[PDB]
Design a protein. Structure first.
Length: 377
């Protein structure tokens, strides 16, 4: 099994106990650590934060303590846009420029691979031709990584991609059966299914549909997303199920209607640390005073409300349920967004350090046998 965990290079700017750096990283927590995010300059892989080079050394230095650990660098993300990807994949020359830059960059900074996080080929302004061009990019990278291993004698660089769960995005951008052959693993973004952009409350990451749902809405859940990627040709062993250590919040139209599907007027109040309306870290929801926690029986996930605030999130129990699910489907493991959104320092939830991600590790049977300081949940 794999446990793929994302580090984010902006978590260093959060205040107080929520501030996260590589020193808060546990080298033996995950099997693969992915660094979000790199960018692109003149079709070449580039840093995005002023101290990335410092952080790269600390991040990849974790392998000195756990030599089994693999690291990857993720390019793109949700604020990156699409135009730079579009321009880079548009010609063989630009793809070659990018591919060679990626090999050089990853080797220089001691990363073991590249994770592609384009949001998304064929959507969000990216033209329809980018679907086939993304396939070509994936093939170009896989082939060039293979060749570099042959010629250098080094362990081959890994290639992964973070891919969407929603059928509209999948069909617009992803030749699933083709790319799955060339990717080492596929990081399924099984979250952001619902959120404050919608007029009624809904859960960030429900495992199954609600009985009431129909049409396209009935596929906005983890099980449907997993089955979608499997049926479209991803080998189960390559499919890695995303797990969110965050939730999505709503302001209710009325404090007297707190159901799933209740009317909402907009985003929930921003959290005290993450400061982004509509989103909360697990550590911002786990210890919410005077709130009422509920479970969505059909969907196997919790929500919590207080006054006119409603948040759908994941807890230890839902993570256990989802790992049981992925094992039943024979998936290659779990992926988690993100290290800095779990209670990484144990400052909030009274469940020790990394309660959610330790739960993943435990349920995947990945607890190091020589481990001393882990906490079972
Ligand atoms: N593997 C992987 N690669 N990329 C991803 N996902 C992780 C979840 C991201 N998704 C949530 C990121 C996010 C999570 C928690 C918080 Cl407090 C703030 C931001 C993007 C998002 C959507 C709506 C509003 C703001 C931002 C979207 C990218 N997963």
């Amino acid at each position: 099994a794999k446990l793929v965990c994302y580090f984010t290079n902006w978590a260093q700017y959060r205040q107080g106990e929520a501030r996260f750096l590589p020193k808060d990283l546990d080298p033996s927590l995950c099997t693969h650590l992915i660094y979000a995010f790199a960018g692109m300059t003149n079709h070449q892989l580039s840093t995005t934060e002023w101290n990335d080079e410092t952080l790269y050394q600390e991040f990849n230095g974790l392998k000195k303590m756990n030599p089994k650990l693999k690291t990857l660098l993720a390019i793109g993300g949700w604020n990156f846009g699409t135009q730079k990807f579009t321009d880079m994949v548009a010609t063989a020359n630009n793809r070659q420029t990018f591919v060679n830059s990626a090999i050089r960059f990853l080797r220089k900074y001691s990363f073991d691979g590249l994770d592609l996080d384009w949001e998304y080929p064929g959507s969000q302004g990216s033209p329809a031709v980018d679907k086939e061009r993304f396939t070509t990019l994936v093939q170009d990278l896989a082939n060039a990584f293979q060749q570099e291993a042959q010629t250098s004698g080094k362990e081959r660089l890994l290639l992964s991609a973070a891919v969407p769960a929603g059928q509209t995005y999948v069909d617009a951008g992803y030749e699933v059966d083709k790319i799955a052959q060339n990717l080492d693993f596929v990081n399924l973004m099984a979250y952001d299914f619902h959120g404050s952009w919608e007029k009624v409350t809904g859960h960030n990451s429900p495992l199954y549909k609600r009985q009431e749902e129909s049409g396209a809405a009935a596929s906005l859940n983890v099980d449907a997303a997993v089955q979608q990627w499997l049926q479209k040709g991803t080998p189960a062993s390559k499919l890695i199920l995303g797990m969110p250590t965050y939730g999505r919040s709503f302001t209710l139209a009325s404090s007297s209607d707190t159901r799933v599907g209740a009317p909402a007027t907009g985003s929930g109040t921003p959290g005290p640390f993450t400061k982004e309306g509509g989103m909360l870290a697990y550590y911002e929801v786990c210890s919410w005073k005077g709130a009422t926690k509920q479970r969505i029986q059909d969907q196997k996930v919790p929500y919590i409300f207080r006054d006119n605030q409603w948040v759908g999130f994941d807890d230890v129990e839902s993570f256990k349920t989802k790992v049981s699910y992925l094992k039943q489907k024979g998936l290659g493991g779990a992926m988690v967004w993100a290290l800095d959104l779990d209670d990484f320092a144990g400052f909030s939830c009274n469940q020790g350090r990394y309660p959610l991600i330790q739960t993943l590790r435990q349920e995947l049977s990945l607890v190091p046998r020589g481990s001393h300081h882990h906490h079972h949940h």
